[model samples]
Target chain A: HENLYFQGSTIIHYEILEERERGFPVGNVVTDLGLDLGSLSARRLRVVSGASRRFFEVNWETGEMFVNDRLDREELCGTLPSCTVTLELVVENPLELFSAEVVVQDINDNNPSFPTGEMKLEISEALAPGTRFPLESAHDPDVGSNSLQTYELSHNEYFALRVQTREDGTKYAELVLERALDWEREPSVQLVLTALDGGTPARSATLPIRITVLDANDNAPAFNQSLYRARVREDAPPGTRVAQVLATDLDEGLNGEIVYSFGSHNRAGVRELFALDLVTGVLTIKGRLDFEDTKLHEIYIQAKDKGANPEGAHCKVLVEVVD
Target chain B: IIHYEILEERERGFPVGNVVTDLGLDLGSLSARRLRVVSGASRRFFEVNWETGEMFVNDRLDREELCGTLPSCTVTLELVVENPLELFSAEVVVQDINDNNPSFPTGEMKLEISEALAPGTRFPLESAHDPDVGSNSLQTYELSHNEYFALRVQTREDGTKYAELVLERALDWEREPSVQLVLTALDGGTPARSATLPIRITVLDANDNAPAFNQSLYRARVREDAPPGTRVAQVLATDLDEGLNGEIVYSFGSHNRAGVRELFALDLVTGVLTIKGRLDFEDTKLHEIYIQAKDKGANPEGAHCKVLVEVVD
Candidate 1:
């Protein structure tokens, strides 16, 4: 078995599927790296050095190399566009050397994630319940089984979620209203949407939604308190809950949900001192409060719903300041 | 519209070399100005030299962090001509070179297990990570030699490696307080790279097995003239439990009275019962004794056995 030949180096290119665990055969070096070391018997031919030596095994008799462990393209390639595993093989008697490369192909392993978290849509109450609203699709980097496959909408009485495949093979979710809109019943609805993939260990993303019922304001906003008399300490800080107007809307959905604001009837400095919760009609301190600066500030608050040109109501707020 | 490939290391900037694949664009025949990128991922990744029709990397390439985990990734570039609004693209498949070494998050890992666990029980191990893709990624695991434990690996949908440490045999805290193993993760790159981690096993206590005798009856024949300490017969026992729960000691049981104890001696450690006194056929031709085997653990039960001897004059 004492025969020898030599060459500087060689580059062999072959393709392998990602996720083919260890002990997998990449290719035959004797055939791929078959240099002229003809006299050197194959018995002493083995891997002398290279990175792939750990993951691949070379046989002396057959000259076949098998995968020694698992291969993950994602882990291997990460965010890079491509990847290749390299190794070197050696023949004993001839003392020859060779370099080999195996390119790994990608398979879907990522599930879609909603970047915006939630997509909001406004529907007019006048429109029929069977209306369909298309939503922006989720984004997934992986192809095949790892890409976005479908969407699911949490249980709702009036709405059902459906997906349609676009010409580009992308999936977009559509909100289908099953029952007609009734401002008296559900003024607003919240739907939990989930996007999923077709992989064995499936991946998913959730986008919780809050629906705003738009227009046909049947019920006007009314103040539940006998009189709007609220109090706050002089030392009250910003973001402190001052006084909740506690306004209620007779109409349901977005129409019933009231948005309170200091409209045209605000005394000077009222805008600088307070902020309102649009849907809840809660008044919060926006700046440092001082009873000494102004013993009391009177402001006219207006409540309106998001109905196309909706009805409006007004109430006077008497905020009392105490040391 | 040329098909080309370039092998590069992760996170390396490009233009790579002078050898950018060209599709034989007739740049000399026509004067096309305002050449721009229209669409495709390569549009964001590559910059084009309209005059020469050569492409350069607009962004750095990180094999492990790009193109969604493809062993061989292609960046598509669509070139557009302003005058005629003509469109064409180049598919440049960038290959990866193994440059990153496999690494573990921690140098030391601790694991807890039940001492009562049987052989073949498996425990998952934290896999090492390689920033490089394909063969350059983590390929296999090598663990320190400890007959009771072994290494196991698996692949995920993407290209991530999952590994586990399996129990080849039952654990015995009495034999060892904690099993120490040096776990090494290796990659398939040329001049393969590896990362080593130390794993410690902590076994908890349990009593789950009982002592058992290999034989139910043992019979021996000896001459009545035999003297003390004469070899007679031996008994054997085994236990499935580990540690002190499995160790056994032999002795004569409740059935042994005057003749048995006075004439026979049983070795506690080896379970070899020998003649301690002279045996007389005239007194009694048959001698029966009940032997018991118990473990070292507190109150561990014993395996009851019978040994009979007959004397010949």
Candidate 2:
């Protein structure tokens, strides 16, 4: 009396563990579809047709459907949260139709690997204990317990490894200074850092780490004048040199190179209206300089030597605006 | 949705009309593929031309078996598609060919009546039935020529006719103590179907009629605090069958509920109802009692009337 009756219409689903043999059939989903074309002519039924974009073989005569290729879950769904394949079954006899889905599950098919074979690190002989230097971690496309795990830094008394998890779930390790260094004794230390995976038979890759302990520089930057103040009209265009600063480090070469930066007191409003020259130590206006709202401004600056264990000096400058 | 009638004249295996048009399927024109009768219990009773959608009667329909002993003979079949996965329920109603005769469920009827009955006092008569629908079913009634009783026929929504024994003239018990009559039911069919029912009426003259109440249910209201012996209400009933029949005595029947006799009293001659015991509105507010009335006669007959007394604050 009604037209509501029909089969589950589910197609047969068959799956193979990821990275299966290249051309072997996975499994059978025929019984899952409740298909019995025994009473129907074999010629009347068709699979997804001769269309060649295929992952499985749909039998044309005896209605045999099987997986045709090995699947790599990582390659197929690296950008997705999960992986599944939905295939169609079409019949010309009763104008029938059905579609089934196959899910490809992950296996520990990949070994953790660091993209580089060698790593370089610069250190100061006078570096204090407990200083942390972050290093780039290895990569593994697999998820779950199979992904990139902890690292093993060649045992060293001077440095310890510290790991942190990023928001994306990857782990990175840093070199923590266990004790102070002396430039005179063993100027450099070469060690190996290995990345490992938690797979059954754990796989790992090692990279070389070369650390150079440079000579120390004791004197901090000393500016000609501790503070310098200057002002320009509110109508002054951007890039207006508001003031100049000069400092000298007693250390030579890399130990003597100094870079100027706005210190902790560089307010967001002042940062928005000004720019500091990292190499030149010049402060310039970067935005509209208006005094109708602000009568005066204060900018904090710091200068540091590039020496290993270098020192830094901080100073504040006050600028009173003019009409 | 099925919309077709498979008419049969006791013949099977004969093709009826083409199915698509017979059932108003509106499958439209498909010069290639055939309409299918793919599924349904009626699959055996009919088949459709897969190419032309033509339908023919099945070879296995047994009308008597399917219709059973009911008044109509019909065979219902669940039909399948010759096309693609579709089903419909069809009824191959065995249309009447006047095969059955109209007959009464019983052979005779006996009625006892009083000769004093007035004209227009009608009595029910058993209607005749024919095990067929439409033209083959019972259509009319014919009563034997009589001066006292006439046949009053009634038609039902289903087209079945009913006959009533209407008293057209008053009976004379002195002239005849009994009357014999026959009623015949006829159907509209060639070589029409008909049946006869014999009826006998006996007259009564002895003192027999019972007193009857004006109201089958009597209702009255009274204040619960009223003093004992207060006049609650009165009941009136009369008799119409014989002389002195109007003389009736009233009283509470012995079957009255236990609390009745303790709480109320009924006057046998005047029918004056009253409260006898303390009236408590808290325990019970409504008291129901059965009142018995009987005519004073040699052959006394009686009737019980229901009376409800409501006690108010």
Candidate 3:
């Protein structure tokens, strides 16, 4: 008598994208599986917990299965291409377990993003054309065409962008110099690198590139005016500003910074009576001036650039003491 | 009956499964039966092989575009076989995924509350919306931590969860005139997606305080022939409340005698009790006047002060 079994079992299959709202019907178990309505309550037709009993429910009268809570395919199955949940329905009266499989499909819901934000690159003006620089790639959790597809670099005259696909289907971008770089003409270049997806009305992300050009001290410092003239009173107090000298260099960085000092070609007492500021190029009276002792004074000022093999320029200042 | 599960957006010609094995039919005899599939009017989504009894997708399927927010999506078709003229019903259910983020109806919400309102008052907030269902839809709300308010969430009959802001502490217009809070709507998906809306609350003034004068008594000296409209011992008052409730109006009180009223006048808006008529030492060496300062509340309140003036030649 113990050799008798309850009933024969069959397997049923169902498909739904993960994330169906609550109360969404799966199918009519009574009509599809041909279960008896009268005995449903007493037999206790229920779903066993593996997909988590909290996520699904079955109706009594309609005999329809429903989505009771949220279903996340990524959270449920991770990055798997195919996801299926095995559900078991038990009929308690005769002890039968019905095998039901629900398949969860993937959707294009993620956007491509770079690991970090903006990127900085240094290029030397001495480097030749056709030099290539490798760049970091963006990542997308989605699979297939929805993942990162291609890269585009902003329009510019000096550089062009190229995308390379690896053996495993990952994509990377490289920047190629098409023209020359001159630090004097442009000190830095800004370009936007965009990552795009293959989805319709495609999703994209951008990263900014800041490229700084290196200089070689190509130009020398030059004074705008070769001569300077100023007047001072004999009774004027010491520390009076006599005159100011200015010089400029077209280069960048330390190659262009100019410093001023008193030249060796100054008059006999010019060094003792006048002081020149090294940074501001300002000339101030250092000692007392007497109209009777010395009416006129001639001084030489020099502007020098800082770097290897520094260049210098000279200008003359004439000071007349008034009585 | 035949059933198969295939993901949406699969390319055309992607194979589903063997129909002959599932139906327990011979694959060799399938060609003789002339097996085919028939889906109504619209372009067919799947097709059957005559010889192998295999099903293949015929076109791209977009669950969202086809179902348009219907929670449950299934496509039904009829499988026809020739020799005996038998038909079988087949169905394919489309699944959903988290594709949309929770969003508010407006970028920000503005509210005006009276300072007189007590703590525990509740204000309803607008609900956030998401097209996706189940756990991927709007789950709960959060309010940025603040001193005066807290967030309470409630679910409606339609199964949507909304939020409300409860006043946790009383508002003081003088201390904090306005408050800015952020309401964040989050979903239950992994790496939960959320959106925020700014909640700006302005504290309106209540007629809670009456005007008060700087001093109760004032003494002043005026010349014997002081001209009319001279500023003689002006009285000033201040109200702590804001807006019209804090605005003070000045006038001669009922306690002032006719002689004092006839000689002095007080400004209506500014608390300036000035000499309206001529002042003479012979007529009256000393004059006393009572001044009142009242706020602009509907049911107003006021304070009083007395001004004593001595005429000097």
Candidate 4:
């Protein structure tokens, strides 16, 4: 100990909220350090070194510490998990050093928000239920429980909301389709998505979502009748009306229009004897017919709607040739 | 001379040092001679105790407020002992402590920069101030990282360091109307004390965008025998820029015939085209008029729209 001249020191801890006004009482230094307050001013007590000494000052007579200036934890430590202002104090006469630590606590002062006011989601009505669509996450600069915690989606028939947390504990939202969508019934939907933080008197933000329901060929074409009987002259000339086949689709656009054609089961000479209008679903005699050669000819016709995945229906026609 | 070093920020009545030990005075002489401290500026800060031969602080010593940011702070005192009336010179050096944080003049700074400013353009910022001397003074400035702006720290001949915001990328008012940055000032202390000020920059509008009509061609019908001052049609054009850059005025283009201007009047502020002269079916069954919408910026931009008016009986 002969070679060591460094004085003994003790660590003193204090806690204060960020942005405390100047002159806010911090802690009692003289009393805690076992100093005489009656003659405390004789020690020449002062905050000497360390980075955060400027933030505090000691009243030598009282041996108490007080805030010297503004204390902003965010500007000081940013997003650090813990923030402390370390300081060193010097007492003259009989020299000694005291380490003072001031822990700056946080408060809820920020609100959660989104980068955008509105978001657009283009979804196909053909997608199955339980499908999830990732959505943009709200941003909250605060840490701990004061950050964004959950998301809520407005009440809707086709969609539900789900919130997920990442490894870093950031919460995000996703849209889950709860039911099948029909464009004819609902072409577009408007919803409000909310993000809430877990602070006292919780803070929240909302984003408007405009969901466009894309068209899909989900309905099949249906013929008016499954069977039709018609009589044709033995020498029916070209362009003579044979029969009309009607079909309809419950879908929209071209997916709702039916196209008529001779089915694969048509008679060998059916294409040569009859012509079908692909758009209007009409049938006409395109060639002459002979009763001596054939008593009856059975023709099959198919009706299909124009769509990416076309759906079709078929019907049969009994064409009996007469003398 | 007897010398002693005492740290600043001491309260009154704090003992500085043993005056008798530093002066090599005999302890027996303390009881015979009454010691007294007398001085000019340091007189208010120190007092000598003859009984213990100790010099104690008589008042508060704020080095920054008293001696300012000087490196060497001292107070001279005359130690006078009565009976024989012996006088001795003594000195007390007030040592510096890191007691002041670097701070800006304001908590926030606002700037308006035009979007037309090119990259590498520099904008000077207000420097921070620190009352601590030597290594405890403000040494460097740091700016928050951003896509459009970067920080440039510069020092003066007197060792004063300041910062400038340099444009690193182009600014688009339509994309981002405002930008926010943090400028931090740090001192040269061991654990470097720092402070931050928010810099909010409002991107001012530039005349980089031109006025655009809703449609390139417009068709309208008016009665042939309509009297003067009758409303024809209202033409609309929009500009993305704000303030004077977005303001538009409507007028007849050079392509319009001389009769078109005389027969029709286009409102400058609002784009409503009105009949200025009498219209007759025999004179003109249909009129083809050309109009121009120009912005009110220093370097103006214009857009043209052709209007086809059919005179109906």
Model 1 lDDT tens row, B63-116: 454442344566566666655566666676777777678898777889887665
Put down candidate 3 lDDT per residue, B1-313, tens digits, no spaces: 6666665567888887677777655788788887778775546888988667778888766665555344555666877787888877877775656667899989999999877655656676767877665677789999999999888997754466878788878778888989999999998888688999999999987766778889999999989777888888778899898778888888876444334666787778777777877887855688767777878873355577889898898
Considering only N, C-alpha and C atoms within 3 Å, which residue pairs clash in candidate 3? A16-B95, A17-B95, A17-B96, A21-B134, A70-B135
Off by over 4 Å in 1: A1-323, B8-32, B38-43, B50-53, B103-108, B116-118, B129-132, B152-170, B206-299, B302-313
**How high is the CA lDDT of each candidate model?**
0.68, 0.68, 0.76, 0.78
Candidate 4, residues A1-323, lDDT tens digits: the string is 12212354234778888888889999887766777677778889999843222889888778889999877665555545577777787887788776777898877667889888899988778665666766767877565777788999999999899887754355678788888778989989999999998999889999999999988776768888999999998888888878888888888888787888887544235677789888876788887787855678777888878874455587888889889
Under CAPRI classification, how is model 2 graded? incorrect
Measured with C-alpha atoms, the lDDT of residue A229 in candidate 1 is: 78
List the candidate numbers ranked by TM-score, top first.
4, 3, 2, 1
DockQ of the candidate models in sequence: 0.00, 0.00, 0.00, 0.00
Please give, for residues A1-323, the per-residue lDDT of candidate 2 as tens digits.
12212475243555556676644555433434445656445535545643223666665555556656657777655523456665666766557666655777778888887767788888876554656666657877666667788888998868899877754356767788887666556778887888888888777788889999876664567778878888788788888898888788766577778889876434334577788998899999897766864678777787888864345676677877777
Q: Rate residue B33 of model 3 by lDDT.
A: 83
Predicted complex 4: CAPRI docking category: incorrect
Error of 3 at B37 (Å): 3.4
What's the TM-score of every candidate structure? Answer: 0.31, 0.33, 0.44, 0.45
